[PDB]
Amino acid sequence: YYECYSDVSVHEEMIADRVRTDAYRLGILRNWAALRGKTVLDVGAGTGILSIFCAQAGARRVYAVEASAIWQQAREVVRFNGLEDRVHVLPGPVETVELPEQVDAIVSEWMGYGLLHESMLSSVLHARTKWLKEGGLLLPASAELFIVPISDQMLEWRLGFWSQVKQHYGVDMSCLEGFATRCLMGHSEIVVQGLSGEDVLARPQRFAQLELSRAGLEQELEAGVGGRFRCSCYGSAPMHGFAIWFQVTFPGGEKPLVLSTSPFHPATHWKQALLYLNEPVQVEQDTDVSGEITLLPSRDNPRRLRVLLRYKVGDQEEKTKDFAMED
Amino acid sequence: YYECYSDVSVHEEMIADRVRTDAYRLGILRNWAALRGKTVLDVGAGTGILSIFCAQAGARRVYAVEASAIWQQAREVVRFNGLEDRVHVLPGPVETVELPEQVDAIVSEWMGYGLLHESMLSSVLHARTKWLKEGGLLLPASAELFIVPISDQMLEWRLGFWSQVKQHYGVDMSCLEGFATRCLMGHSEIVVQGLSGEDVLARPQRFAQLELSRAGLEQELEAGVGGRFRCSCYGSAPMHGFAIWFQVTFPGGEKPLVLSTSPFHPATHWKQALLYLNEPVQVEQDTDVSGEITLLPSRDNPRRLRVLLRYKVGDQEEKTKDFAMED
Numbered sequence: 001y002y003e004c005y006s007d008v009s010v011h012e013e014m015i016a017d018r019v020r021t022d023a024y025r026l027g028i029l030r031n032w033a034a035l036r037g038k039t040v041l042d043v044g045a046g047t048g049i050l051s052i053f054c055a056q057a058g059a060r061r062v063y064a065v066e067a068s069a070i071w072q073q074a075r076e077v078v079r080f081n082g083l084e085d086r087v088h089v090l091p092g093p094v095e096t097v098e099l100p101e102q103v104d105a106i107v108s109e110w111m112g113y114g115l116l117h118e119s120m121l122s123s124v125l126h127a128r129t130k131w132l133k134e135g136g137l138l139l140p141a142s143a144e145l146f147i148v149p150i151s152d153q154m155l156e157w158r159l160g161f162w163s164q165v166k167q168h169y170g171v172d173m174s175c176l177e178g179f180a181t182r183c184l185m186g187h188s189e190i191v192v193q194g195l196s197g198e199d200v201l202a203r204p205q206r207f208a209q210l211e212l213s214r215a216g217l218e219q220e221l222e223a224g225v226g227g228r229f230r231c232s233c234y235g236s237a238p239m240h241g242f243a244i245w246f247q248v249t250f251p252g253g254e255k256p257l258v259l260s261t262s263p264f265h266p267a268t269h270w271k272q273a274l275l276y277l278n279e280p281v282q283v284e285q286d287t288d289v290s291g292e293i294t295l296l297p298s299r300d301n302p303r304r305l306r307v308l309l310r311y312k313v314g315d316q317e318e319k320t321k322d323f324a325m326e327d
Numbered sequence: 328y329y330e331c332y333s334d335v336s337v338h339e340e341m342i343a344d345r346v347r348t349d350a351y352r353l354g355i356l357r358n359w360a361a362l363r364g365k366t367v368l369d370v371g372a373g374t375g376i377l378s379i380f381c382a383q384a385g386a387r388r389v390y391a392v393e394a395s396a397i398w399q400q401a402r403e404v405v406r407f408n409g410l411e412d413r414v415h416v417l418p419g420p421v422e423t424v425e426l427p428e429q430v431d432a433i434v435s436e437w438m439g440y441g442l443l444h445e446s447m448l449s450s451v452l453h454a455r456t457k458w459l460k461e462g463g464l465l466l467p468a469s470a471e472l473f474i475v476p477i478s479d480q481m482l483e484w485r486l487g488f489w490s491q492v493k494q495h496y497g498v499d500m501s502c503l504e505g506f507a508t509r510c511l512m513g514h515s516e517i518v519v520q521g522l523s524g525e526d527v528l529a530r531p532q533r534f535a536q537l538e539l540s541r542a543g544l545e546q547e548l549e550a551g552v553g554g555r556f557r558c559s560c561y562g563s564a565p566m567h568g569f570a571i572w573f574q575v576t577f578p579g580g581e582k583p584l585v586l587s588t589s590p591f592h593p594a595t596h597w598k599q600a601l602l603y604l605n606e607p608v609q610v611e612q613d614t615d616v617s618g619e620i621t622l623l624p625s626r627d628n629p630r631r632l633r634v635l636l637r638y639k640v641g642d643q644e645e646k647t648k649d650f651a652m653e654d
């Protein structure tokens with residue numbers, strides 16, 4: 001016994017996310033021809049599930065590297081499944097692990113909220129450089145970031161709550177809408193929240209593409225990744241801000257398999273990352289929404305995501321609002 | 328503007344709790360004959376809603392005392408409802424507020440999780456002693472605590488999760504049930520969680536009664552409140568521990584109005600407080616469950632609730648497990 005509530009809950013949530021975990025299983029299995037008889041490094045193996053997917057896909061040897069105490073559980077899951085000759089669970093950070101050979105492939109689930117919040121991406125790139133054979137397989141191989149203006153229905157309900165008190169209790173609290181807006185939208189924190197398709201006000205725009213084999217990607221991440229965007233709204237709505245999300249792609253190796261966290265696709269534990277304006281803005285059919293967005297490490301905590309945003313909605317003047325990931 | 332996310336969310340949750348807020352409205356209105364033309368102190372007035380209920384009930388003057396920044400919102404709700412001649416919002420803690428008279432009544436919603444976690448009860452008793460007229464009204468007037476053995480279905484699902492991985496992903500993770508049990512039940516924290524009637528394994532037992540007018544109740548709270556209990560289980564079940572909850576009573580004052588947080592009654596934001604055994608124990612029809620329970624302030628933080636529990640299930644030996652409120 002050690003206190004392990006966080007350990008089990010985090011791994012439960014990941015494995016319960018079927019969209020995530022099936023995307024990795026099928027993404028890996030579809031590369032069976034490239035993995036059969038080959039070696040694999042699983043960066044951040046957790047409970048060992050992806051390492052075992054690789055063995056199912058036919059790998060001769062999988063190195064399951066895991067820095068935290070959950071490695072103990074990984075060792076047990078492998079022993080219990082009788083795969084200890086094929087999957088070797090190794091303690092500690094990938095940056096200092098010692099493998100006996102370069103590998104044919106790396107597999108990793110490294111993506112954080114907003115893709116880059118508290119992500120293991122730097123560790124995956126460190127391992128690719130140190131251990132992956134020239135021309136080796138990376139699963140997934142790339143990631144893309146998307147942005148779109150949104151109307152959050154749950155936020156709308158919360159903003160309107162104070163005007164419904166009279167109907168329920170004979171006390172008029174509608175004067176608190178200002179207060180509620182300032183508290184719920186006036187902050188500078190990125191809010192993780194699940195939206196649906198009807199919340200999306202325009203065509204989503206891709207604003208960055210991250211090819212994990214690209215030279216200098218580590219330095220891109222430090223300078224900031226992102227870019228400009230532009231879109232046109234579909235109809236009348238209270239725009240509350242933007243949602244950002246990602247997808248990652250597995251080569252087939254056939255056509256690629258995409259794991260998406262878009263509000264149009266089945267929900268994942270990543271949900272989306274929301275960037276609220278200080279207050280709502282009414283948009284109409286064809287309202288132009290544009291801007292420039294950058295994702296980079298926070299100054300005071302290099303594993304916390306910060307977002308620099310400059311945007312323009314219709315005829316409103318350009319505005320800056322910069323965010324950091326919620327506590 | 329100040330950062331006020333916590334402010335609005337806490338008050339939203341309280342006012343959205345209709346069971347709570349209607350119990351106070353009807354509890355107060357039913358005492359209209361005793362309040363009409365009289366004076367009231369609202370201890371911890373928040374947004375001012377209970378103070379306005381008192382004015383609706385006919386009070387001549389209500390002192391709405393509130394220690395934190397939400398007082399500013401209270402002042403606005405009163406101004407906006409045009410009740411500033413009848414309801415006076417006053418800043419700061421009730422312990423140092425200066426009223427111009429003793430009052431005919433105190434109203435307060437002071438109850439925390441498990442009744443006594445981070446509760447304002449000491450402040451209500453301080454105000455009763457300092458400001459309430461001899462024979463004055465207290466709303467509510469009393470509280471009662473209850474305990475019962477439980478089977479938590481949501482916990483059961485979480486304990487069983489690891490044995491379902493094989494069906495979904497071809498990896499057998501059933502060997503992790505031990506781990507999951509240790510992490511989810513082996514800790515010593517009180518867990519706030521909503522149960523339903525079917526989770527209850529026996530007749531609930533009252534283990535304490537707190538009459539707010541009782542002399543020396545402050546000293547009882549410091550020594551610990553609680554007592555012994557005994558009950559008999561209804562049928563075969565995996566017992567996970569105990570749930571505790573409270574009710575408070577408003578004199579009519581007609582028959583009393585009771586605000587209950589029992590799992591048999593409509594859900595409130597208080598839910599119930601759960602005390603998990605280190606692992607499940609199978610019980611049967613007529614299994615005797617007994618013990619002794621005390622609620623008191625934690626040593627290192629006098630506003631955190633601690634629970635001392637000694638219990639016996641059937642033929643199992645007596646056991647001690649002591650808890651402190653979750654972070």
Ligand SMILES: Nc1ncnc2c1ncn2[C@@H]1O[C@H](CSCC[C@H](N)C(=O)O)[C@@H](O)[C@H]1O
Nearest residue numbers: 014044045046065066067068093094109123
């Ligand atoms: N630098 C590093 N080296 C090794 N493991 C790391 C690491 N940084 C984070 N980790 C671990 O990587 C894991 C990411 S979570 C993904 C777990 C598992 N592969 C699954 O898909 O279900 C966590 O268990 C975390 O402890």
Ligand SMILES: Nc1ncnc2c1ncn2[C@@H]1O[C@H](CSCC[C@H](N)C(=O)O)[C@@H](O)[C@H]1O
Nearest residue numbers: 341371372373392393394395420421436450
């Ligand atoms: N010692 C004290 N004096 C005055 N206010 C206090 C206090 N201790 C806590 N409070 C305040 O008491 C409130 C309790 S929450 C209840 C709020 C409101 N009466 C309602 O029923 O909706 C909080 O707003 C908290 O800031």
